[PDB]
Amino acid sequence: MAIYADNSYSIGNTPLVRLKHFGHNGNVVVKIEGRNPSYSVKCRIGANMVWQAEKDGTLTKGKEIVDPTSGNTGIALAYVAAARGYKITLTMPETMSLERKRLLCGLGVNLVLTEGAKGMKGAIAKAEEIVASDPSRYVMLKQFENPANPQIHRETTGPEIWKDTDGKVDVVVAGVGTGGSITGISRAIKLDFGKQITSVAVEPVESPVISQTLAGEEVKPGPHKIQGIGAGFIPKNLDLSIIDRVETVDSDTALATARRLMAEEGILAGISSGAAVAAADRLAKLPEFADKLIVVILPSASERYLSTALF
Amino acid sequence: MAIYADNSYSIGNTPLVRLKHFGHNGNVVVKIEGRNPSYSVKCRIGANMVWQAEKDGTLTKGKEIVDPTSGNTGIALAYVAAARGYKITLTMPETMSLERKRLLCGLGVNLVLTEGAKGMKGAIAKAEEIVASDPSRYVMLKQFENPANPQIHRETTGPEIWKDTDGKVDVVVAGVGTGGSITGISRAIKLDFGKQITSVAVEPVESPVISQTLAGEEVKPGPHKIQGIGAGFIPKNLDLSIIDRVETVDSDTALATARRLMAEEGILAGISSGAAVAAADRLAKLPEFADKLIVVILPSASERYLSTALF
Numbered sequence: 001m002a003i004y005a006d007n008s009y010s011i012g013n014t015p016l017v018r019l020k021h022f023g024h025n026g027n028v029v030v031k032i033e034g035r036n037p038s039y040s041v042k043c044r045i046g047a048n049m050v051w052q053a054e055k056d057g058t059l060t061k062g063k064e065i066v067d068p069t070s071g072n073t074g075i076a077l078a079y080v081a082a083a084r085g086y087k088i089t090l091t092m093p094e095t096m097s098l099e100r101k102r103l104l105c106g107l108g109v110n111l112v113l114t115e116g117a118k119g120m121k122g123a124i125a126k127a128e129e130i131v132a133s134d135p136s137r138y139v140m141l142k143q144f145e146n147p148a149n150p151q152i153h154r155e156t157t158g159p160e161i162w163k164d165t166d167g168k169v170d171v172v173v174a175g176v177g178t179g180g181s182i183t184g185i186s187r188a189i190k191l192d193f194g195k196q197i198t199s200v201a202v203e204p205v206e207s208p209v210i211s212q213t214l215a216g217e218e219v220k221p222g223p224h225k226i227q228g229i230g231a232g233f234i235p236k237n238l239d240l241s242i243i244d245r246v247e248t249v250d251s252d253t254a255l256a257t258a259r260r261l262m263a264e265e266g267i268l269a270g271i272s273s274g275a276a277v278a279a280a281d282r283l284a285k286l287p288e289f290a291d292k293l294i295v296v297i298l299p300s301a302s303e304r305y306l307s308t309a310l311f
Numbered sequence: 312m313a314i315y316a317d318n319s320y321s322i323g324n325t326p327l328v329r330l331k332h333f334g335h336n337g338n339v340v341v342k343i344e345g346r347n348p349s350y351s352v353k354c355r356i357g358a359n360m361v362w363q364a365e366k367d368g369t370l371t372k373g374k375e376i377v378d379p380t381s382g383n384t385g386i387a388l389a390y391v392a393a394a395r396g397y398k399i400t401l402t403m404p405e406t407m408s409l410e411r412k413r414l415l416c417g418l419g420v421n422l423v424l425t426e427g428a429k430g431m432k433g434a435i436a437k438a439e440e441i442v443a444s445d446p447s448r449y450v451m452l453k454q455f456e457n458p459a460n461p462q463i464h465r466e467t468t469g470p471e472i473w474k475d476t477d478g479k480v481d482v483v484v485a486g487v488g489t490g491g492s493i494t495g496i497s498r499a500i501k502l503d504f505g506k507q508i509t510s511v512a513v514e515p516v517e518s519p520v521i522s523q524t525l526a527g528e529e530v531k532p533g534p535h536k537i538q539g540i541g542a543g544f545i546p547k548n549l550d551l552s553i554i555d556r557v558e559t560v561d562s563d564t565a566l567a568t569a570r571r572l573m574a575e576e577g578i579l580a581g582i583s584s585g586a587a588v589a590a591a592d593r594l595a596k597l598p599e600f601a602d603k604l605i606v607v608i609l610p611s612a613s614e615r616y617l618s619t620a621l622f
Contacts, residue, residue, distance in 0.1 A: 003328070019318065035348075037343075079579065098616060111506075265318065266390035268350065302417060303614045
């Protein structure tokens, strides 16, 4: 029975592992989203954004996916496009790593390398240009605003946490990129299962736009090394209404924490996994949370970060 | 309930995915062993070899693991040693990739870099030297001969295939490194579940020592690029008695096949996964196997091969 018709259907059912060298008496548990078809949390939204676009007729045989990304979402949409028979063009300029170019090329992406000077702005503008060229042939799935992003987390990630913890989860800590994870999970546990948990968004202290927004302060994004989070704006797919707390973490600490997960826990965590753990560790050691079960999303795996400051 | 006490307990429960561009009418299904704590099939034997050595008293608090390896088994034992609180020294010379040195160092391995000239021979000899230095402090777990290797495959991998296929599996195709996978799986399905499947070992045509042995021909190992299989000898953990067929695959075909799995199936397969699939595809297209369910082990994930001919 349990044979997936293609790799997209195999998303999720990722395990919870209790940490030994973080938290207090095992109150911190991590969900290993690296255990996915293309090795990140984004595999879930790659799958669901394609499936939803199919069900609503925005994606059909012959139409071609376009997206300005080279990160986890790009890899996720690439595997799904390959599995389901879509061409996909990802736009990212020329300054991207040879490794990622090779990985996406390996996955069969039509790579369009924009002007380096234009950076993310260049790549986005170029994605938009190709949709323009034939809007009935190209489709941008728009991870930052597409509801199919948080919805998959509400249907899979959140219920998996509920079931795996026998409903004992008290706190969910998740870094925010698109906001889909924390949103979907929070909706599931709070609204579908009815438990009043503490939802904790994590962002870089270098670019704490959620914290600034909620404090009514000037939004001042900044550069940081915590790949995957800290986009420098509030994404539409972050439901601020379900966020109970925002924890800020600095790049150095996130990196050191990822290294500790590897060397001390034997968990091959990515950089943003280090950020989420450091934030969860801080809450875990406040007496208010010490008899509470804290579940932390670890979005990606270490080997995706070999060229990075992680190593 | 489903919270693992450390990362070692989270091994296995890997998914089966049906291939669309290989076999005949979906008769080829792949088991994605890349979905494991340290991202390979070896995570299972890393876990079980440590657990068994604990239960039999050969591994205790304070004793230190030594092993001459830098591959998947090295990474598996590294994560388990980290998770369970053992020092581990891996011996491999100086000519190994910076990436792997960084990955194992990241996992907290005491790296001992032997003479390059001595290669695998050098590293093995050096491992043995350190055991000699204090045999009550050091332990070599010996993946090629330790029964805890095939046993974990008999208890987990094989039953998972049985359950996931509702006992319809007719053929298992697995490349042979230590031989533990094909051995354990075969024992489970044939002896524990009682079904007379066809067990198919896969080896490089460049180094077809199993085929030569069974034909009573001169054993002539040779170099090849199919990392993980083709050790150039018959390992003790290959139970030749349960092998029904041996299929040979060449390096180029294995590599092209891995690239096809990525680009055409959206499966991030490693090199030996390409070898196993090419062999399974050949059987799948013989009329004798065309109404048979073929299950193929995919031992590792693509990103572990970025520095290699795969890309």
